[PDB]
């Protein structure tokens, strides 16, 4: 659904500022 570390869930990973 949402991320995959950002507990938040909102946003996409592949659009994450992991970075
Ligand atoms: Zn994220």
């Given at each position: 659904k949402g991320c995959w570390k950002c507990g938040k869930?909102?946003?996409?990973?592949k659009d994450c500022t992991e970075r």
């Open positions: 869930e909102g946003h996409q990973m």
